[PDB]
Design a protein around this nucleic acid. Structure first.
Lengths: 89, 81
RNA sequence: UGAGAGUUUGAUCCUGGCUCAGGACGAACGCUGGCGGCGUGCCUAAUACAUGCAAGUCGAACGCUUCUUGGAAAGAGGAGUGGCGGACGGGUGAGUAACACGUGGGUAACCUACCCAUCAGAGGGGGAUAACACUUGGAAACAGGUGCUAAUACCGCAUAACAGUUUAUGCCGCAUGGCAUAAGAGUGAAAGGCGCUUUCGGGUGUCGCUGAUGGAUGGACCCGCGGUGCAUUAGCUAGUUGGUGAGGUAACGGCUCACCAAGGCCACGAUGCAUAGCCGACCUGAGAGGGUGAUCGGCCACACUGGGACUGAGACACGGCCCAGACUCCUACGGGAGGCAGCAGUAGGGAAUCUUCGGCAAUGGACGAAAGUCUGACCGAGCAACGCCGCGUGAGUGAAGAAGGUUUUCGGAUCGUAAAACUCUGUUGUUAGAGAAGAACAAGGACGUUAGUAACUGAACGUCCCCUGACGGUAUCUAACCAGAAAGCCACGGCUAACUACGUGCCAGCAGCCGCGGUAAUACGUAGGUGGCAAGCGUUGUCCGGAUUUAUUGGGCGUAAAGCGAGCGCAGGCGGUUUCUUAAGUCUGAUGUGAAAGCCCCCGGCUCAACCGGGGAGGGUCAUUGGAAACUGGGAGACUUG
């Protein structure tokens, strides 16, 4: 039940967010296995700061990227590349 | 206190009842078999395969997981047939 | 990156204790108002808990019932069976001196639905029941009886052993043992759900179901080493130690039974007693090392106290049950009800520690063909000057010392161009607008793409529209007004910058230490003068230093504190010269690991700054593997000085 997800680093008013990749038994900002990506919550068009190297390696193992990961990596087409290089493979 | 697991309580109660019946059925089947093997007379194959059926159907139709059934068939076939 | 200063005497040199100058109050300011950036906030009672919230979901598994519209069916609603989750998430440090933790390792003694991979497959029935209607007992909680009914609920039969032995074969390993092929005895299912073609069709795509092998995720067992005080704590142990066999276990095993012996652990500290959760880490040190275990993160353990299991693969289960005990509320007195060390909130304790606000918009859970529903996780809001960022309380000019203060010989000094006055200003404060930015990417639903089916006709894959922000009138900007609203702390005999007048004048009271007083006090007390931090500054407590005052780095025993009254020797510490070997210690290379955030350094963004981001050095006294053969250590010989 491995699962890639997000992680907050806020202050009071202005947050900063990070993608994080883990197993779903764990808490969100708690433990994990390794690291994937981040993104700016402010200044749209914000800073799409992605690894885009471990998502397809990680879903080769088989996981479930969450709701935000699918949209903001379909902006980079990684989920499009997921069913483009895995349903075609 | 309780919110919605009282249905879980009643489910576990029914499982107690029927699992108690099934496990007692299995144990009495096994002892009914094991009486005959030290006896040495007739009815040595019918109750043999009935004991093996009882163990296997309480393994799969019932549940232990697989291996107490497997250890029993090992210690059984290494003793009777 | 290592600063010493007072105090023993009439004076001197040593040795030596006491005190001070630095920083580390997770929470007491008697002052005061700028804190609007970043963070924290019951450490004493693991004390007792009113009030609400904190776990539900599935109608494409399946029967029944209440409504907008006597036949009508979509949407809605009510209960139940049945399925998955309540073992995650959040709290606390009471216990624990032990494989509980940290690090290195072992699985030829180990287990797992929840995500993919592979192959085998994947029928016909029964018989009840809940719900449902009526009655009995009920104060109630809840029991009971009769009758009827469904399923992916329950329940028996067919088919495969590929698992599992056992046999032969070949191959190998560290003892057991393991790896491939061929064969002797028994074993399942939901046979179900949706949508299409529906001309008998009955083929279906998907979602499910079962068996056997795999990867990955999670849990468990064992092993070497490391972290505490007491020896005014020297013996402890019998399932103990080993063997035999059996039961039992996911798994090995005295885990447990029966038999045979008496073995085991200890001066390197067994056993006993007291205290403590362990770690990554820290506003101490020149460094070796001392002190604390909060954040935040990892592991372990606990749920008013003690036992015990059941369902479930996973619990001996924090808002599950059963029993015993304590305590609390009702009882129609027979009987029942309850466990905030989850979030706020309550009373007591204390030197001391906060709001009973919204939403899942952001993110993360839980179920599902879908919208969706829940979340005191979390996002964020409202308090405490509780600590750190970074800026504020005008600036340029302006006196023979305005007035006036205190002091004086009265002739002057200082307050003090600092006033008064001119010229400029708005980081801000008031008013009003823009901006509600950035906070948000967004299921699904139509339009258009792949390996296959007879057909996206429907399926599993696209671009474009639709839509929503609790704090939000939030940030930020623009423009108008006025120097206006924006100043507080302790001493001045030395250590250690700062003087006067007078009073009480062995007494009222100051002392960090030396030390004052006692009519001429820079020491008691006033009043003015000055000093150092600076919207924060005094006092009190605790931790490291200064301390070479436990000295390995880094001290010494003739008289200062300090060689046992002396000998003899077990164990122990250290050993003469030399040839060859060895490689345990030692030096050296390669490899895996020492979580992330931590501190530092390089680079960058928030107007800089803290805060955040990218990259490597640090933490091994670590594990495997290869050399080096001087010194120490093990083996064989030699020599004569001891």
């Amino acid at each position: 039940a491995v699962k890639i997800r997000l992680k907050r680093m806020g202050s009071k008013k202005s947050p900063f967010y990070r993608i994080v990749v883990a197993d779903s038994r764990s808490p969100r900002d708690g433990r994990f296995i390794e690291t994937v990506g981040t993104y700016n919550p402010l200044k749209d068009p914000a800073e799409v700061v992605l690894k885009e190297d471990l998502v397809l390696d990680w879903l080769s193992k088989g996981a479930q990227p969450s709701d935000t990961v699918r949209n903001i990596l379909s902006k980079e087409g990684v989920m499009k590349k997921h069913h483009e290089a895995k349903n075609v493979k | 206190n309780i919110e919605s697991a009282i249905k879980r309580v009643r489910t576990s109660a029914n499982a107690n009842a029927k699992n108690s019946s099934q496990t007692n059925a299995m144990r009495t089947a096994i002892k009914k078999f094991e009486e005959a093997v030290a006896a040495g007379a007739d009815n040595v194959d019918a109750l043999y395969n009935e004991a093996v059926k009882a163990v296997d159907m309480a393994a799969t139709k019932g549940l232990i997981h697989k291996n107490k059934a497997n250890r029993d068939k090992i210690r059984l076939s290494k003793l009777a047939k």
